[PDB]
Design an enzyme around this catalytic site. Structure first.
Site, mmCIF file in Angstrom:
data_model
loop_
_atom_site.group_PDB
_atom_site.id
_atom_site.type_symbol
_atom_site.label_atom_id
_atom_site.label_comp_id
_atom_site.label_asym_id
_atom_site.label_seq_id
_atom_site.Cartn_x
_atom_site.Cartn_y
_atom_site.Cartn_z
ATOM 1 N N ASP A 88 0.847 -1.266 0.000
ATOM 2 C CA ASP A 88 0.000 0.000 0.000
ATOM 3 C C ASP A 88 0.862 1.288 0.000
ATOM 4 O O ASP A 88 0.679 2.194 0.851
ATOM 5 C CB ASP A 88 -0.978 -0.005 1.203
ATOM 6 C CG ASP A 88 -2.104 1.070 1.122
ATOM 7 O OD1 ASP A 88 -2.373 1.659 0.045
ATOM 8 O OD2 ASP A 88 -2.707 1.298 2.194
ATOM 9 N N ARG A 102 0.256 9.308 1.949
ATOM 10 C CA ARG A 102 -0.378 9.156 3.291
ATOM 11 C C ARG A 102 0.335 8.143 4.229
ATOM 12 O O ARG A 102 0.088 8.196 5.453
ATOM 13 C CB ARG A 102 -1.899 8.801 3.181
ATOM 14 C CG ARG A 102 -2.150 7.439 2.568
ATOM 15 C CD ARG A 102 -3.650 7.004 2.401
ATOM 16 N NE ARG A 102 -3.691 5.708 1.682
ATOM 17 C CZ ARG A 102 -3.692 5.586 0.372
ATOM 18 N NH1 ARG A 102 -3.728 6.685 -0.374
ATOM 19 N NH2 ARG A 102 -3.672 4.388 -0.234
ATOM 20 N N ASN A 103 1.193 7.261 3.657
ATOM 21 C CA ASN A 103 1.969 6.212 4.382
ATOM 22 C C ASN A 103 3.477 6.492 4.462
ATOM 23 O O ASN A 103 4.264 5.540 4.712
ATOM 24 C CB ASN A 103 1.685 4.783 3.757
ATOM 25 C CG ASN A 103 0.263 4.284 4.086
ATOM 26 O OD1 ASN A 103 -0.354 4.718 5.093
ATOM 27 N ND2 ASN A 103 -0.245 3.369 3.278
ATOM 28 N N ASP A 152 4.495 1.914 7.651
ATOM 29 C CA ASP A 152 3.321 0.980 7.522
ATOM 30 C C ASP A 152 3.593 -0.164 6.519
ATOM 31 O O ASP A 152 2.655 -0.750 5.921
ATOM 32 C CB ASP A 152 2.013 1.762 7.185
ATOM 33 C CG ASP A 152 1.357 2.435 8.407
ATOM 34 O OD1 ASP A 152 1.799 2.259 9.570
ATOM 35 O OD2 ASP A 152 0.292 3.058 8.189
HETATM 36 C C1 GJ7 Z 1 -1.215 11.558 6.675
HETATM 37 C C2 GJ7 Z 1 -1.262 10.376 7.726
HETATM 38 C C3 GJ7 Z 1 -1.522 10.828 9.182
HETATM 39 O O1 GJ7 Z 1 -2.123 11.884 9.311
HETATM 40 N N1 GJ7 Z 1 -1.101 10.107 10.269
HETATM 41 C C4 GJ7 Z 1 -0.284 8.877 10.286
HETATM 42 C C5 GJ7 Z 1 -0.072 8.616 11.794
HETATM 43 C C6 GJ7 Z 1 -1.423 9.103 12.321
HETATM 44 C C7 GJ7 Z 1 -1.353 10.476 11.690
HETATM 45 C C8 GJ7 Z 1 0.017 10.984 12.143
HETATM 46 N N2 GJ7 Z 1 0.738 9.711 12.287
HETATM 47 C C9 GJ7 Z 1 2.045 9.581 12.827
HETATM 48 C C10 GJ7 Z 1 2.798 10.740 13.114
HETATM 49 C C11 GJ7 Z 1 4.106 10.630 13.610
HETATM 50 C C12 GJ7 Z 1 4.650 9.363 13.852
HETATM 51 C C13 GJ7 Z 1 6.075 9.248 14.368
HETATM 52 N N3 GJ7 Z 1 6.895 8.114 14.131
HETATM 53 O O2 GJ7 Z 1 6.540 10.258 14.971
HETATM 54 C C14 GJ7 Z 1 3.811 8.172 13.552
HETATM 55 O O3 GJ7 Z 1 4.361 6.935 13.868
HETATM 56 C C15 GJ7 Z 1 3.942 5.636 13.564
HETATM 57 C C16 GJ7 Z 1 3.443 5.316 12.302
HETATM 58 C C17 GJ7 Z 1 3.129 3.969 11.998
HETATM 59 C C18 GJ7 Z 1 3.337 2.941 12.931
HETATM 60 O O4 GJ7 Z 1 3.024 1.592 12.624
HETATM 61 C C19 GJ7 Z 1 3.896 0.856 11.808
HETATM 62 C C20 GJ7 Z 1 3.513 -0.421 11.382
HETATM 63 C C21 GJ7 Z 1 4.330 -1.205 10.542
HETATM 64 C C22 GJ7 Z 1 5.574 -0.723 10.102
HETATM 65 C C23 GJ7 Z 1 5.994 0.553 10.530
HETATM 66 C C24 GJ7 Z 1 5.144 1.341 11.377
HETATM 67 C C25 GJ7 Z 1 3.835 3.268 14.202
HETATM 68 C C26 GJ7 Z 1 4.155 4.616 14.509
HETATM 69 N N4 GJ7 Z 1 2.548 8.323 13.055
#
Ligand code: GJ7
Length: 271
Positions: A133, A137-138, A151
């Protein structure tokens, strides 16, 4: 210590500081680990995930390591539903960052964001690991302006059926090649198609692909052999690279190694 394996974090070692985002999938917070180390904490909503399958896959994900790939630090699983713990990315989601007009980006900054993502995808291809995916957005942005891929593989463990097949009302139709929409044929070459649509999102400053069509109308346009057209900020040489990712025949699309070589050549000529 006692009780925990190398892929497991004790939640008593976390301090919570500020909210970063919230959705149907859950909530994400900023915090510290053992007082001193910056982390992000994703809290998974009850009933949303195939949890025992995800925990087995997390063991493999721990051993993936690259400067342009978001690093997994571990998981908290003794208290269903789980937490996922990662490195901290202070400037947030790439899609929201592109849509802020105050940045006044130069085209050399947009080409460097494309190169960051291409290096991460060349590394995943060398390990035979599919994203499944890829989209703006990812992806995430750090305190120094560097873009990293997030992700990776996660859609395999999501239980809501509206997201999981081509028919579903939440499937990524606008990032999918003809052989996925017609036959469900996923491969290295469906990640290559999605990377071309991501370069179009960067050069368009975060516009929705096929912005005046529905998902149903987009699937028909693509099957008839028609395509996205050139963003105003892309040169003829940059448009040629994104268009090569959209060949009707999957076997005539490039690899991530070849795409990286094409991007470095245009950086040298447009410098
Ligand atoms: C445009 C998308 C959006 O608005 N998002 C994505 C997620 C929710 C919101 C902001 N956000 C976000 C911000 C900052 C971080 C960070 N690392 O500081 C963050 O962190 C994450 C992201 C995904 C995760 O899960 C994951 C699964 C499999 C492989 C890698 C990561 C965990 C933390 N998210």
């Amino acid at each position: 210590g006692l009780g925990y394996g190398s892929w497991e974090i004790d939640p008593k070692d976390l301090t919570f500081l500020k909210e970063l985002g919230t959705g149907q999938f859950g909530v994400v917070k900023y915090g510290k680990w053992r007082g001193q180390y910056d982390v992000a904490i994703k809290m998974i909503k009850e009933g949303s995930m195939s949890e025992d399958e995800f925990i087995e896959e997390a063991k493999v994900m721990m051993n993936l390591s690259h400067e342009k790939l978001v690093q997994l630090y571990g998981v908290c699983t003794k208290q269903r539903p789980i937490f996922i713990i990662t490195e901290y990315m202070a400037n947030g989601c790439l899609l929201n960052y592109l849509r802020e007009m105050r940045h006044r980006f130069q085209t050399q900054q947009l080409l460097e964001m494309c190169k960051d993502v291409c290096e991460a995808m060349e590394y995943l291809e060398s390990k035979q690991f599919l994203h499944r995916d890829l989209a703006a957005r990812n992806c995430l942005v750090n305190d120094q302006g560097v873009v990293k891929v997030s992700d990776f593989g996660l859609s395999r463990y999501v239980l809501d059926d509206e997201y999981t097949s081509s028919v579903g009302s939440k499937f990524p139709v606008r990032w999918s090649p003809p052989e996925v929409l017609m036959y469900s044929k996923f491969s290295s070459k469906s990640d290559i198609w999605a990377f071309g649509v991501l370069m179009w999102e960067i050069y368009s400053l975060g516009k929705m692909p096929y912005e005046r069509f529905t998902n149903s109308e987009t699937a028909e346009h693509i099957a008839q052999g028609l395509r996205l057209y050139r963003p105003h900020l892309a040169s003829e040489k940059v448009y040629t690279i994104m268009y090569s990712c959209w060949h009707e025949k999957a076997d005539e699309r490039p690899t991530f190694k070849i795409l990286l070589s094409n991007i470095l050549d245009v950086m040298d000529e447009e410098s």
